[PDB]
């Protein structure tokens, strides 16, 4: 056997828990049990996702620590996200399109 893992142009349906650095939870996709599908790699998604996400197999979990820098910047995203907010998440990759 040999496991595919994301690469650049990848579609992955992407469960993701996002916590602030206050610990609060600001979004996920595990309540709604809605996975988040999208093309790695494309400007789809935060950039601390896409150059962060690579490499993942389906079933593993990881976690990213992205300064604003990488997510919505100073702007922010209300409501729940603050201009010039350290978002953690925790990810896990469902599926990748791909291998199937």
Same mark, same amino acid.
Request: cysteine-free; charged content about 30%.
């Given at each position: 056997?040999?496991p595919?893992?994301?690469?650049?142009?990848?579609? &992955?349906?992407?469960?993701?828990?996002?916590? &602030?650095?206050?610990?609060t !939870?600001?979004?996920?996709?595990?309540?709604?049990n809605?996975?988040?599908?999208?093309? &790695?790699?494309?400007?789809?998604?935060?950039?601390?996702?896409?150059?962060?996400?690579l490499?993942?197999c !389906?079933?593993?979990?990881?976690?990213?620590?992205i300064?604003s820098? &990488?997510?919505?910047?100073?702007?922010? +995203?209300?409501?729940?996200?603050?201009?010039? +907010?350290?978002?953690?998440?925790?990810?896990e990759?469902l599926?990748?399109?791909?291998?199937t």
């Open positions: 056997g040999s595919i893992k994301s690469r650049k142009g990848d579609v &992955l349906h992407m469960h993701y828990t996002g916590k &602030l650095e206050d610990g !939870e600001f979004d996920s996709s595990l309540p709604q809605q996975p988040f599908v999208f093309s &790695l790699g494309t400007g789809q998604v935060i950039k601390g996702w896409d150059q962060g996400l490499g993942m !389906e079933g593993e979990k990881r976690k990213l620590v300064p820098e &990488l997510g919505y910047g100073e702007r922010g +995203a209300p409501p729940k996200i603050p201009g010039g +907010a350290t978002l953690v998440f925790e990810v990759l599926k990748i399109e791909r291998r």
